[PDB]
Design a binder for this molecule. Structure first.
Ligand SMILES: Nc1ncnc2c1ncn2[C@@H]1O[C@@H](COP(=O)(O)CP(=O)(O)OP(=O)(O)O)[C@H](O)[C@H]1O
Ligand SMILES: Nc1ncnc2c1ncn2[C@@H]1O[C@@H](COP(=O)(O)CP(=O)(O)OP(=O)(O)O)[C@H](O)[C@H]1O
Lengths: 530, 530
């Protein structure tokens, strides 16, 4: 439970993100990220690079966004990459049928005049929404007589709407193209040279961190529904018969809420299992898929996602994408309900074959006299956009005080900047201290900034908390005059402080941010300062 | 002088970059960057972030690429952002008139039957190509009777061709849009909130590092002419009356080739002046423009550009962009002649006014009772693409040996990875040494990789040189058996080696890469090893 209104106001005001082309009315689904928003957005991409590319020695490539029609036709995007759209016969307003039907049903379940028996029937309908194909949706749109959410008019029947943007490469119109809806395709088209890097053996993973475009129908979910976002996709090619990851044990003891496809149809709830035990019962097919599922859990957590609001929902029989056979999604409980922030699929061979059969160019690998095989790819799809937004809601808190101050409990690895060095006076009396501390912090690799804003030391930290600065050191007169020279180390979340010698503080803030010492540990070693 | 053919072959083979959608024939102007290409491309963006954003405390924002028609119409891109295109009346092949006329004239100047008097007349025509407007070009295309470079047919008259990509945002066609040709526009549309960050005072600079799209007519310049590239633009807003940068002295003693607009019309050559002296004579208007010009020189140099092939050419009277009044470009002497890699303009007020007058929203600032002024922006435009490619040619060398081996003399700050630790055997005899050195290097922050490839130690380094790895440490038996345990430190460019104790090598390689010690210094302290 989070007050979205209050939050968005803080985010936009401190400029984390805001409506793109605002002075023109803005375009729904498009936002610009201000300074802090970038510092945070950057820290997350940096953490991801470490957690995956670096930790797994993933081959990184950077393909183009512009794509010639022929390429996406083969992958099957020109045909299946779409959403069902409806529009009131009156004017020409469009809506994503998929969601409008869900918005309506939720409206009925809320009305007090609704029977318990119907409430159920509907809950069953919503828990199977991503399965209802073309026809099935048309009927539900009749049975429930869904009508325009605005000036309730009559909606035309649900029709598919290709989400890919369209353009023309070069003068003339002989080469029509689209803006890549995903990045994965680029890695497949380069499978040859890529496989060559690993001596030709499997498994090997290729990755990409770039922009994808999705001409969303009716974006109304803040940063959740954008037509332009940055995503980090991993394409882990493995031998279909050797689907066993040599590191699965490093993430086997992790306990996370799994929501099988069965539990979704068998009407029961998600169970908090153990990955190791998960693979046993057969919930999670193999251990490769299992390994990444665990790593994904670790990443999201380390970046600011709350475990008590993070689950992995499996897909339904016919919910499968036009390129997958099995899949699991990392969903976060937000103010918009459960939403897919990271998508981990298991699109066995499909892709490579399509491009090979179309271009008349072989894309395979061999294994020991020797047999050629079609690699089975597990693609963890990260939406850095939704992932960041989740961190926003999960860490946005309101300080217990009439002034209604807010703050984000951002981990030290993602906060705009870890420490905030703020002195009382800027005269040449404090400089020798501010200068030292700063440079000292830098040597320890702790991002910081010397606060200049006006107001009381308490109002200073008030602005610091808003953008979620992890810590803060107060340098007052007793620090400059008294001796030993000690400063005040203030914790963001607790607001509780400490008084240690200003020379040792750097190493202290370092361990605190790096998770080598607990704030409790600090209060035990040094004298508390009210 | 560089053998482009040989180079491109090495780049593509080691996969620095290559044709996007290769297995489909590829699309001209589109390329994909392989692993090494990314490591290098990343290092350059990282260096730029330090050299500018970090060194100047620039406010970083990240706007959208999709832009609604109304926004670009105001900036004046829907009208002037184009190139003159011609096409042979036979089939429908298009060409950029601007360049075809230049290709033809160069053909004539080469023919031995050309008179000295005409050769001149033409040299004068080419040195004024970016000034010839619509009509002027049509005539030259008649006087010289230019015809299709292929199967020489007849070219239609030169007509403008808008370079901006076109699409449609959202279902329907009520909101037509383009893919931003530049990033600057985004910073202007956010001038309000941005100015607020600096307390409302000037000067203050905003920056952006993102992708821009330019539907180039006929791309045939490798990575020089792309329809999709990453650029880092800086928008330094300053008071029109206070055009004086407080750091100009830090870059005043720099000596760099300046090519005034006069020297371009007065038919003389570029002079290697001193920035300080440059501002005096009035060559470079103010010192703000001068400061960035110096910093730009430093950056390019630090990344791998050769001074003897780097100049700053000023624009011509009517060469000015549709948004500028004065400008200077950093051009690199490549195999394609002189090309603009970094563009530093001085588009005084223009922009902010246009958006304000169109949206009926004021975008100004005040100064001390108080007067509101229209900020004069100096926009340094970096094309990380062309900049990287220049580094390629300027540092690509061929080893003097029949085997025809190649290598790139990449600075330590941009090389894929600084050091290459390569042992002879991988047995548990060397591991205790490889492990230590590696971890030791990491502690010193030196990017490295343990070489595994097969072949002689000399053939191992042969592959290392190709991707331009700065150094390399050889760990042989005398390192494991003999004591003290010393390894071999090999320099890339010189191939000359050294023999120092394997424990001290880390700190040595660190200073070498960080420019704290010269390779000559090393050969003076430690025993040479043949
Ligand atoms: N419009 C959007 N805005 C932000 N991120 C998006 C996005 N569309 C996709 N993503 C990212 O990429 C997604 C990969 O899974 P996809 O199957 O492509 C989502 P989907 O099911 O096709 O659309 P939907 O979840 O809105 O129904 C990640 O879940 C999400 O972070
Ligand atoms: N097609 C392209 N490919 C690579 N970089 C490009 C590019 N177009 C522009 N840039 C980058 O952005 C440029 C900014 O100057 P611009 O005035 O926009 C070039 P221009 O004069 O408009 O086109 P031209 O130099 O090809 O005639 C930098 O010089 C260049 O690095």
């Amino acid at each position: 439970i989070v007050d979205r209104a209050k939050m968005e106001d803080t985010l936009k005001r401190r400029f984390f993100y805001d409506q793109a082309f605002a002075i023109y009315g803005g375009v729904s689904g498009l936002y610009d990220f201000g300074p802090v928003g970038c510092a945070l957005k950057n820290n997350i991409i940096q953490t991801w690079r470490q957690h995956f590319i670096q930790e797994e020695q993933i081959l990184e490539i950077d393909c183009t966004m512009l794509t010639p029609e022929p390429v996406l036709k083969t992958s099957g995007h020109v045909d299946k990459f779409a959403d069902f759209m409806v529009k009131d016969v009156k004017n020409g307003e469009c809506f994503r049928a998929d969601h409008l039907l869900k918005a309506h049903l939720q409206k009925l379940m809320s009305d007090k005049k609704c029977s318990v028996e119907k409430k159920s029937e509907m809950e069953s309908v919503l828990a199977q929404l991503d399965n209802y194909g073309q026809q099935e949706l048309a009927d539900l749109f009749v049975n429930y007589n869904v009508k325009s959410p605005i000036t309730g008019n009559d909606l035309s029947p649900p029709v598919s709407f290709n989400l890919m943007f369209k353009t023309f490469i070069g003068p003339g119109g002989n080469m029509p193209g689209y803006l890549r809806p995903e990045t994965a395709q680029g890695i497949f088209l380069n499978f040859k040279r890529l496989l060559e890097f690993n001596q030709g053996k499997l498994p090997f993973a290729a990755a990409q961190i770039g922009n994808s475009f999705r001409n969303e129908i009716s974006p109304r979910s803040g940063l959740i529904r954008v037509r332009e976002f940055t995503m980090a996709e991993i394409e882990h090619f493995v031998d279909p018969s050797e689907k066993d990851h040599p590191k699965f044990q490093n993430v086997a003891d992790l306990h996370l809420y799994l929501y099988s496809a069965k539990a979704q149809v068998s009407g029961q709830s998600a169970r908090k299992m153990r990955l190791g035990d998960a693979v046993e019962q057969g919930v999670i097919n193999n251990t490769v898929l299992g390994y990444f599922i665990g790593r994904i859990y670790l990443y999201l957590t380390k970046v600011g996602i709350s475990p008590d609001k993070l689950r992995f929902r499996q897909h339904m029989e016919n919910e499968m994408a036009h390129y997958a056979c099995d899949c699991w999604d990392a969903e976060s409980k937000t103010s918009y309900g459960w939403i897919e922030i990271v998508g981990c699929a298991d699109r066995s061979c499909y892709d490579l074959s399509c491009h090979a059969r179309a271009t008349k160019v072989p894309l395979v690998a061999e294994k020991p006299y020797v047999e050629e095989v079609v690699p089975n790819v597990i693609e963890p799809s990260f939406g850095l956009g939704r992932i960041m937004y989740t961190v926003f809601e999960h860490t946005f808190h309101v300080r217990e005080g009439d002034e209604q101050r807010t703050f984000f409990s951002f981990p030290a690895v993602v906060a705009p900047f870890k420490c905030s060095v703020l002195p009382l006076s800027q005269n040449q009396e404090f400089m020798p201290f501010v200068k030292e501390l700063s440079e000292a912090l830098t040597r320890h690799g702790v991002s910081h900034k010397v606060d200049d804003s006006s107001g009381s030391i308490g109002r200073r930290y008030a602005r610091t908390d808003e953008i979620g600065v992890a810590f803060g050191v107060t340098i007052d007169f007793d620090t400059v005059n008294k001796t030993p020279h000690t400063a005040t180390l203030r914790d963001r979340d607790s607001m509780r402080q400490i008084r240690a010698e200003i020379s040792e503080l750097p190493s202290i803030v370092q361990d605190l941010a790096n998770g080598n010492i607990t704030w409790a540990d600090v209060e035990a070693r040094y004298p508390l300062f009210e």
